[PDB]
Amino acid sequence: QVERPALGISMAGLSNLPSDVISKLKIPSNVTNGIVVASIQSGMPAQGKLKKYDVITKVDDKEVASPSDLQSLLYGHQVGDSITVTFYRGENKQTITIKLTKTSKDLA
Ligand SMILES: [Cl-]
Numbered sequence: 001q002v003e004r005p006a007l008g009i010s011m012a013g014l015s016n017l018p019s020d021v022i023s024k025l026k027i028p029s030n031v032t033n034g035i036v037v038a039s040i041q042s043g044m045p046a047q048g049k050l051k052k053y054d055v056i057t058k059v060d061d062k063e064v065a066s067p068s069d070l071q072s073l074l075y076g077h078q079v080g081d082s083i084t085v086t087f088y089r090g091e092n093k094q095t096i097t098i099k100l101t102k103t104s105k106d107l108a
Contacts, residue, residue, distance in 0.1 A: 004075045005100035006107065008044020012036045013066040014055065027055050027088045033065040034088070041107075049098050051089060058086035079103055 014022060014034045025036065034055040040046050050056075056064060059073045060083055077083065082099045 001075070002104045002107075003079075004104060005077050005079050005081065006044060006102045006104040007046040007050075007074065007098065007100075008041030008102065009037050009046045009050060010039040011056075011067040011070065012038050015065060025053055025055055025088075026090045028091055031055060031057065031088050033057065033063065035064055035067060035070055037087075045098050045101055049096050050085065050087065053089075055088040056085055057088065059083055061086075074100075 012035070014032060014036060017036065034057040037046070037050050037052055037054040037056065039052060040050060056070065058064060059070055062073060064070045064073065074083065077100055079100055079102070082097050084095055084097050086093070086095050088094070
């Protein structure tokens with residue numbers, strides 16, 4: 001469904017990554033469930049909000065631990081909605097709001 005809102009991120013689940021990859025994120029040792037932001041597409045809603053290596057732990061105050069968990073929530077929204085995101089930027093536990101202003105109509 002291309003009309004679904006798009007953030008413009010690629011992801012990896014923490015539970016799927018080797019120990020050495022997780023150590024490079026410099027997140028607290030008690031953060032074991034989450035989604036690493038692997039890349040951000042220019043001009044998409046995540047740009048200027050999230051950053052590469054952020055580790056998302058909640059969306060809309062609901063815990064997420066895999067790319068599919070985030071997709072389930074993101075796709076329950078419509079364009080024009082906003083989401084909250086809780087994430088670790090290194091040791092910093094942060095929250096941000098992102099307005100879902102794009103669809104995937106121009107992505108393939
Ligand atoms: Cl949140």
